[PDB]
Amino acid sequence: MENFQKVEKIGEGTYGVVYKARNKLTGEVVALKKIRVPSTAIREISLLKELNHPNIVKLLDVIHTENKLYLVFEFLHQDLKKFMDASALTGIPLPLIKSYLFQLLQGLAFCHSHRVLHRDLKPQNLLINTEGAIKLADFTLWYRAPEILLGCKYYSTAVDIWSLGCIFAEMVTRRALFPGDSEIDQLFRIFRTLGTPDEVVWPGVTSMPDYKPSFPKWARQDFSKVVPPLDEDGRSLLSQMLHYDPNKRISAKAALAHPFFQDVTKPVPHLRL
Ligand SMILES: COc1cc(N)ccc1-c1ccc2c(-c3nc4c(N5CCN(C)CC5)cccc4[nH]3)n[nH]c2c1
Numbered sequence: 573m574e575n576f577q578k579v580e581k582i583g584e585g586t587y588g589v590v591y592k593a594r595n596k597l598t599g600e601v602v603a604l605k606k607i608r609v610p611s612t613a614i615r616e617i618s619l620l621k622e623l624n625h626p627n628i629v630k631l632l633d634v635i636h637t638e639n640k641l642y643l644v645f646e647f648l649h650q651d652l653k654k655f656m657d658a659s660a661l662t663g664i665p666l667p668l669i670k671s672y673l674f675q676l677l678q679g680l681a682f683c684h685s686h687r688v689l690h691r692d693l694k695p696q697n698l699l700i701n702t703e704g705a706i707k708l709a710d711f712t713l714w715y716r717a718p719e720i721l722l723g724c725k726y727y728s729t730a731v732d733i734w735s736l737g738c739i740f741a742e743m744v745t746r747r748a749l750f751p752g753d754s755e756i757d758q759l760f761r762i763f764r765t766l767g768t769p770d771e772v773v774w775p776g777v778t779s780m781p782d783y784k785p786s787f788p789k790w791a792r793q794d795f796s797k798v799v800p801p802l803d804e805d806g807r808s809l810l811s812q813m814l815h816y817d818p819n820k821r822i823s824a825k826a827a828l829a830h831p832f833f834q835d836v837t838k839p840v841p842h843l844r845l
């Protein structure tokens with residue numbers, strides 16, 4: 573760590589504080605996470621160093637010293653949450669929403685092809701640069717897939733597609749799709765929009781660990797009401813990302829081929845830094 577000069581505290585993460593720092597050896601400005609250590613951890617994290625892709629924030633170095641673990645990452649200057657908040661009066665233009673969605677699907681398609689899932693996508697860990705890029709980082713209950721909320725412990729890559737669908741909707745409407753403040757409030761916010769799931773639409777749902785037959789029965793709403801002026805291609809894609817049954821939920825790879833991306837481009841955002 574004497575090889576790192578802390579510049580400022582970036583965040584108070586899930587497993588430790590994150591600082592903007594300078595690597596004194598290379599001169600590079602990096603994001604440094606101090607984890608608050610298991611050997612099983614070292615090996616798992618050491619693998620993620622290899623997982624390199626333009627839409628995944630790079631793990632540059634893993635430093636294990638004095639029974640402490642420091643993870644050093646590529647640094648980006650802004651997160652999607654900040655940008656969403658800054659774009660709130662006007663909205664993010666559709667071409668940039670589409671670009672960001674496309675890129676995140678590429679990142680996910682890459683990760684998922686290596687059997688690695690994110691598990692906790694949210695605007696706060698999606699990072700953007702001045703080039704029009706958006707990147708997955710860390711690779712709130714608002715973005716949690718229903719199978720996680722229903723107690724499935726062996727969930728799949730589909731959980732990330734759900735979270736991204738929630739983020740897509742939020743970019744479009746400038747409001748969170750399912751802003752729950754408890755696990756059951758989250759689940760019931762989902763049910764009140766998409767309908768209480770049953771064995772017809774989600775085979776196996778009634779045997780999920782935390783499923784209760786006493787769940788109230790709500791009817792499904794029209795997507796046109798849920799994500800207004802989003803066009804039919806967008807709503808079609810969103811509907812497939814938000815399928816209850818994780819086995820019917822669209823994959824990242826299939827999503828990339830959806831007609832919504834027929835005219836995708838890569839605009840440059842206006843970033844105030
Ligand atoms: C801001 O850095 C960049 C900006 C841009 N735009 C482009 C490239 C880079 C860049 C720079 C360095 C590196 C290294 C690297 N160098 C060293 C090292 N050197 C450092 C040089 N010298 C004093 C002797 C000791 C010592 C130990 C580990 C190292 N790893 N790998 N990849 C790099 C990429």
Ligand SMILES: COc1cc(N)ccc1-c1ccc2c(-c3nc4c(N5CCN(C)CC5)cccc4[nH]3)n[nH]c2c1
Nearest residue numbers: 583603605629645646647648649650651696709710711
């Ligand atoms: C464990 O962290 C990781 C794990 C993995 N596996 C992969 C990546 C990362 C990672 C995380 C963050 C960053 C950043 C960065 N974050 C911010 C930032 N924050 C404040 C608001 N919010 C709460 C978060 C965003 C605000 C301004 C500038 C920033 N730059 N650069 N690189 C990172 C790499």
